[PDB]
Design a protein around this ligand. Sequence first.
Ligand code: NAP
Ligand code: NAP
Ligand code: NAP
Ligand code: NAP
Lengths: 248, 248, 248, 248
Amino acid sequence: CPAAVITGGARRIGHSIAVRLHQQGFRVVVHYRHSEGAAQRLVAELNAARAGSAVLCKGDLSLSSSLLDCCEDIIDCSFRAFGRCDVLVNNASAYYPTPLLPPIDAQVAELFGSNAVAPLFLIRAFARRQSRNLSVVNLCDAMTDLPLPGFCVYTMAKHALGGLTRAAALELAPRHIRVNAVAPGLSLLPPAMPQETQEEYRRKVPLGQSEASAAQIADAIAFLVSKDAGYITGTTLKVDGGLILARA
Amino acid sequence: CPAAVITGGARRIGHSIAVRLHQQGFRVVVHYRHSEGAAQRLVAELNAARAGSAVLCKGDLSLSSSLLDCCEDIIDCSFRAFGRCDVLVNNASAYYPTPLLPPIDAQVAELFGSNAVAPLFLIRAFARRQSRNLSVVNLCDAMTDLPLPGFCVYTMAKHALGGLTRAAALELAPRHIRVNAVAPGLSLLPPAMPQETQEEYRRKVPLGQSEASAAQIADAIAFLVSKDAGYITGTTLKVDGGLILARA
Amino acid sequence: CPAAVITGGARRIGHSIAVRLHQQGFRVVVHYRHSEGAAQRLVAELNAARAGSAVLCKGDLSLSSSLLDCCEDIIDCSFRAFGRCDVLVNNASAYYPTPLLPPIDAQVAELFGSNAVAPLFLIRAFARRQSRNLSVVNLCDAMTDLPLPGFCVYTMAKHALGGLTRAAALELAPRHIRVNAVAPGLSLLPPAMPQETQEEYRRKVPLGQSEASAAQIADAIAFLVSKDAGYITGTTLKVDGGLILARA
Amino acid sequence: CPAAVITGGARRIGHSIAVRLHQQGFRVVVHYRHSEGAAQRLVAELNAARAGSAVLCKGDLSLSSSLLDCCEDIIDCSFRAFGRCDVLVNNASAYYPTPLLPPIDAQVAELFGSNAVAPLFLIRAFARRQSRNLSVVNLCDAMTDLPLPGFCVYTMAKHALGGLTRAAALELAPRHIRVNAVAPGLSLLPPAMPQETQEEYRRKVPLGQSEASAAQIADAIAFLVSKDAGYITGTTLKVDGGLILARA
Ligand SMILES: NC(=O)c1ccc[n+]([C@@H]2O[C@H](COP(=O)([O-])OP(=O)(O)OC[C@H]3O[C@@H](n4cnc5c(N)ncnc54)[C@H](OP(=O)(O)O)[C@@H]3O)[C@@H](O)[C@H]2O)c1
Ligand SMILES: NC(=O)c1ccc[n+]([C@@H]2O[C@H](COP(=O)([O-])OP(=O)(O)OC[C@H]3O[C@@H](n4cnc5c(N)ncnc54)[C@H](OP(=O)(O)O)[C@@H]3O)[C@@H](O)[C@H]2O)c1
Ligand SMILES: NC(=O)c1ccc[n+]([C@@H]2O[C@H](COP(=O)([O-])OP(=O)(O)OC[C@H]3O[C@@H](n4cnc5c(N)ncnc54)[C@H](OP(=O)(O)O)[C@@H]3O)[C@@H](O)[C@H]2O)c1
Ligand SMILES: NC(=O)c1ccc[n+]([C@@H]2O[C@H](COP(=O)([O-])OP(=O)(O)OC[C@H]3O[C@@H](n4cnc5c(N)ncnc54)[C@H](OP(=O)(O)O)[C@@H]3O)[C@@H](O)[C@H]2O)c1
């Protein structure tokens, strides 16, 4: 049975992805940073259906002198628990404003680290430790071509992640490792956001006036790691219900 | 059971797609132009497997005074044979050089008709004649961004098809019809091409140094039509083994 | 002195380009279809500043059996008047809705003809009839990525023109003919449109809440035809005040 | 007289850009890190032509605890020597391999700092310290869509810069600051590269089989800072001689 690492897999989209891949035979590594309780409950729920089919792994993905080693360990964790690592899902991601006009480098460290630099180090480590079906799926953002005002640093990071998806896809093709991305448009809203506001956002979606559910995002991810996407590498699969096509 | 129309579905990619959707319970209308034999052998094979599950339809898709009605009849052929039409696959495509420097308007009529205008009329007829899962999949070309020298017209047509995919996607969103596309890189080579030449082409693909099989392309189309892509509309799915990433 | 052909140069943007190039020393061929009077007033004004520096030319660019020859004559017009043709500016364009749901092929003929096919035949003739600084500038649309609901055919046509800009750029490079494009976002509004509606459009522009003047667009074209863009080919220059960057 | 800041302006492209803006009346800050001799000679050359029209500023743009402060001083320099800053050219850039398969974070610090994070901190400072004509121009890379194997981190950083170009453009529009980019394809080759190798690279450029000269790149930047681009913001101007258009 193939093993999969899911960053930020304790809740929301990452959680849904960890469950989908597990439902498909995958022995899923549930990485987290602050959501220990949720990660613990997930690993228990999964291992309940299948003994030793899940383990958790804690690690801060923000930029720092320890990041590199942490990423090596996150990957090494999959090998200790399952003796292999077939899939890596870079889902973990910080998201908040960094307005240009009125601490910053701490925001830079967290935004750039989780969205771009960690995935890089993780992909790198994942590759050097490697037939079967090896692949990486990066979680992008279909709306970054339309930069949300005040989110410059996050936007930059996601663009860097996009560049990493293509650079790694080409460089790793010879190693039989596919590298793709799933770019949601509007998906799980912030739980604290007022319903009125959530509704205003849902109505903007051309297809169904609704955000993508975590399961619909996981549908796309399951496909890219499946055999049905065996010739697919370097592609970013948009799942936005046509949101990016609408004009202001 | 649902019904799907596959233009140019008598052989190669279009054949693999008709077979695939049929294997998933679809009733198929196999359109063709000159591949009368294959069209017949396929429609019979499918009917052998399932009585009254496949019909055929002959037609030219080049620009002309009779194109509009031809497309209406192709779609109408699905409603007559099965009383319904849920999926439309725009696979039919003319492909050949049109060098700017040493008949042109005839080439423009055939290249643009098959690759863009016909798909336009087809989607139009399809949408006007329409819960279920209605979707359209256009067959694009991942390499049209790197214009093959001498294929100016073909390239313009495919580009028009991409605009069609997104324009229709948004416009038909309220009608619950999803419009997406699959963009192969190097797939089935011309049967007349010498092996030496075919091998020079295959070797350029980063992932495995091989062209995409028809089944691998059929895989992406099947995914975009499946329920696993219910939130996807207006997206082009590249299936090129990283080909578009390599520099000359 | 170099000669330039400006399609649809009788009024608005095309008129401003014509004048701008003339002011830079170009001998111009003001082409029109129905605005003979505006064309004549322009050609008259230009020749008053420099004798024999401007001639007008009439022709319909819609698809028809006469299109190929008409485009040939438009280019042949530059050579008859000035004995040369150094610059081609594809600005003439048909623009109106073509909703998918409640004559079409005549709309296709006009929208595809003026926006895509005529430019292809004109570039073809221009290239075949050829150191200096030879270049072509296609007038695109920055918002065609966010398809305006109900303008499917127009959008497809402009995409085709984009595909042409690049295919021609690469294929004509060995002939030292550069092919580029300018893509306005919101420029000259319809003269009939109510000031209320015009103002609602203006306020959407992030940079100044104003549409682009004909001159500003002229500035971009002038730059692309100049020596200052001698290494530029196959590029599309966006001029939208950041309009394409805003979210709905 | 407006004042401009040019990072990495001591040699090659940055040197040519500084000279070009200076010729247009611009008071140009020449930033450098290691090329003290060169920077000193350029400023002397410039002042010699116009007393007090040039000054230099030293600063490492790699990621570090000092970067934020350093970038602030770079912008501050323009205000100290000219009491104003109208133009920022983010030209400084590290470029070298970081292969995925056989110190890394130190490479990430140098590659991401110079190409993406410093520009971010510089634009941030620049905007906070501000009619006239304010604009930023980022030096991008037209080929980063075709990731050069082995240059992953450099590629990711340039992608982040492209993201910055668009996010900043939209966010600073209300403040009247235009943010654009110039993307060279093949320009000045490494001085130590053998001619044979240099020739191989040159022959790949479709337009003239030659790399772009620093002056041709400088031309594009001079246009984007000029009044002739007053409506232009958020656009990346490719200057590649058609290179990005050729298939492998
Ligand atoms: N939700 C949407 O609408 C939407 C739309 C487009 C794209 N996306 C993208 O889709 C993916 C999933 O979105 P989501 O909404 O589920 O994400 P999210 O809820 O924002 O969660 C990201 C998770 O990753 C972890 N994380 C964040 N910063 C980290 C850091 N510095 N170090 C280590 N872990 C860190 C956190 O885990 P802990 O809780 O364990 O700290 C956090 O729960 C993301 O990459 C996102 O950008 C989401
Ligand atoms: N093969 C590749 O490597 C590759 C790469 C990128 C994209 N694609 C795209 O993928 C799709 C399938 O590729 P393919 O290689 O299978 O295509 P293909 O073999 O060229 O088949 C095109 C089919 O469409 C029909 N057709 C051609 N011209 C027509 C016209 N004027 N009017 C009506 N029907 C016409 C033909 O039917 P009859 O045989 O019945 O005459 C033919 O079977 C195409 O849209 C193509 O552009 C293919
Ligand atoms: N205005 C904007 O906001 C905007 C925004 C984005 C892009 N654009 C693009 O910028 C360019 C110039 O815009 P514009 O507003 O000045 O255009 P426009 O006013 O619509 O003018 C198009 C001109 O082309 C000619 N024309 C139209 N249909 C024709 C046909 N079938 N055959 C031959 N000639 C035909 C007309 O000439 P006669 O008057 O002689 O009949 C007309 O003057 C166009 O290519 C447009 O797509 C404009
Ligand atoms: N040359 C090409 O073919 C080409 C092609 C595409 C894009 N470009 C882009 O065009 C721009 C100019 O290219 P170029 O070839 O002239 O550049 P380059 O010679 O590579 O020089 C970059 C300059 O920036 C400075 N620099 C590098 N790393 C730095 C760091 N960590 N901190 C502070 N300064 C640093 C250096 O200044 P000191 O010497 O003072 O240390 C160096 O001279 C770049 O942004 C480049 O990416 C160039």
